[PDB]
Amino acid sequence: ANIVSVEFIPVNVAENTVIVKVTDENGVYGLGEADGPPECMKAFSEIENEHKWLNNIKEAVIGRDPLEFRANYNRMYDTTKWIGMRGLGLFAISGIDMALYDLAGKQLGVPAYKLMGGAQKAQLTPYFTLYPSVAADATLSEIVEAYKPLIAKAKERGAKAVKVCIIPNDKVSDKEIVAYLRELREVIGWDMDMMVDCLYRWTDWQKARWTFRQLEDIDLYFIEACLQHDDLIGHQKLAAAINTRLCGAEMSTTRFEAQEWLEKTGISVVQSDYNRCGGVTELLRIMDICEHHNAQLMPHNWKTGITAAAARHFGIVCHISEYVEYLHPDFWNGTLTQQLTLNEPKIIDGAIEVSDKPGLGIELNIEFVEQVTGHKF
């Protein structure tokens, strides 16, 4: 069955995503999501054709067989080059590409990981991103108290690894950041890996160098979003100077950017996002490039149960990576995280099951969607 329609469905809650729904001639549909401001992303998908490199993105897949992942990706990418190629246009390709793996999977009656090359590990072991709910201008001390229940729950579930964050705070010194992360290591203990997301705190690599030299003894597994995203040279200098993994490419799009990060900086973990960088088809190309560089691919993953299902299948395929980033409802109370999808797999001993349900295995809360979009489904 060939593709008949593509729909970008904004989901705004008073917290937002764009559901990408791709339907075939039999009425079977695949789901995915695209990053970006939802009404803007919808307008992007409904533009009128202009010339050879500026076409409505949908027209590159209407009438096509969703199995043909490379052909469809290249077609979307080529016909929209003038408004795409990098950035927001790639978000929209990502969403459709994700929905194509779900659709083709449901058409064939096979789980998406099979269409991604096949399971290459016995188990999926994520690292769990812990972000605490606190007030603006909450102090470092209050943030640590808020982290306690989250960290306690990760232990209770047997998590192998957790990431904590530095909430952006320019009223606080790097020496106070050092004490803050030393404290968090104490609370986490030494039976889980500890990653830090710096959330772009630093601009001077030598100031980051000072900090993470102080912290060598808390044995960080990786340091993420340390310096500004454009500053490749600062990254390469920092990575050569520290004694663990530096991450990068969180906000990037395409294998081309991923590859430049790898070539230029020596980051050991690449974070190109499922719903930003061009999607699963492009992530698979980035995996093969990561492998040559002996780098891990842990795609940024902080959206909805739709992306979580894409991470489950890609995760069981991505043999080069010990962990992938995971947003689990046990640790986050966002309305979409709790309500958009149903029957989210439980964390058992630090692992989550990847079911062999056809496609991405997504159980959408259709009634919740119809409720909030006000439009029927």
Task: Enumerate the known binding-site residues for Mg(2+).
Answer: 197, 224, 250
- Cα(1)–Cα(105) distance, integer angstroms: 12
In terms of CB distance, is 91 or 364 closer to its own copies? Answer: 91
Cβ contacts of 206 within 8 Å, gap of 6 or more: none
In terms of CB distance, is 187 or 320 closer to its own copies? Answer: 320
- Judge residue 34's burial from the number of C-beta atoms within 10 Å of its C-beta, 0-12 exposed, 13-18 middle, 19 or more buried: buried
- Cα(138)–Cα(249) distance, integer angstroms: 29
Contact between 288 and its own copies by CB under 8 A: the answer reads: yes
Judged by CB under 8 A, the stretch of 21-29, 123-131, 226-234, 330-338 that binds its own copies is 226-234
Cβ–Cβ < 8 Å for 126, 352? yes
Q: Which residue has the tokens 């919808």?
A: 42
Q: How many CB atoms lie within 10 A of CB 170?
A: 6
CB of 198 to Mg ion, least distance (A): 9
Cβ contacts of 68 within 8 Å, gap of 6 or more: none
**Identified binder of its own copies from the candidate list 28, 110, 138, 146, rule CB under 8 A:** 110
**Residues binding its own copies: what is the number (CB under 8 A)?**
86
**Identified binder of its own copies from the candidate list 17, 79, 94, 253, rule CB under 8 A:** 253
Q: Which two tokens stand for residue 301?
A: 């993953």
Contact between 197 and Mg ion by CB under 5 A: the answer reads: yes
Q: What does the per-residue mask of binding to its own copies show for 305-344, with x meaning CB under 8 A?
A: ------------x-xx-x----------------------
Contact between 59 and its own copies by CB under 8 A: the answer reads: no
Footprint (CB under 8 A) of its own copies, residues 29-48: 35-37, 39-40, 42-44, 47-48
Judged by CB under 5 A, the stretch of 50-58, 119-127, 196-204, 309-317 that binds Mg ion is 196-204
Where is the binding site, in residues?
Answer: 197, 224, 250
CB of 129 to Mg ion, least distance (A): 7
Judged by CB under 8 A, the stretch of 293-301, 330-338, 342-350, 364-372 that binds its own copies is 293-301
Q: Which two tokens stand for residue 7?
A: 């729909």
In terms of CB distance, is 259 or 344 closer to its own copies? Answer: 259
Sheet of 29-34: strands edge to edge? 3-12, 16-24, 29-34
- Cα(261)–Cα(280) distance, integer angstroms: 19
Helix, coil or strand: residue 302: coil
Contact between 68 and its own copies by CB under 8 A: the answer reads: yes
Contact between 282 and Mg ion by CB under 5 A: the answer reads: no
In terms of CB distance, is 24 or 197 closer to Mg ion? Answer: 197
Helix, coil or strand: residue 175: helix
Q: Which does 256 bind (CB under 5 to 8 A by kind): Mg ion, its own copies, none?
A: its own copies
Q: Which does 285 bind (CB under 5 to 8 A by kind): its own copies, Mg ion, none?
A: its own copies
In terms of CB distance, is 17 or 341 closer to its own copies? Answer: 17
Judged by CB under 5 A, the stretch of 152-160, 166-174, 190-198, 316-324 that binds Mg ion is 190-198
Cβ–Cβ < 8 Å for 252, 90? no
Q: Which does 84 bind (CB under 5 to 8 A by kind): its own copies, Mg ion, none?
A: its own copies
Footprint (CB under 8 A) of its own copies, residues 124-163: none
Q: Is 229 left (phi over 0), alpha (psi -120 to 50) or beta?
A: alpha
Q: Give the E-state strand segments of the chain in sequence order.
A: 3-12, 16-24, 29-34, 127-129, 161-165, 193-197, 222-224, 245-248, 269-270, 296-297, 325-326, 347-348, 351-352
Q: Which residue has the tokens 């490039």?
A: 289
The H or E element containing residue 209 is helix 205-214
- Cα(377)–Cα(364) distance, integer angstroms: 11
Q: Which residue has the tokens 């201008």?
A: 137
**Identified binder of its own copies from the candidate list 28, 229, 339, 373, rule CB under 8 A:** 229
Chain center to CA of 256: 18
Q: Which does 197 bind (CB under 5 to 8 A by kind): Mg ion, its own copies, none?
A: Mg ion
Q: What is the binding site for Mg ion (CB under 5 A)?
A: 197
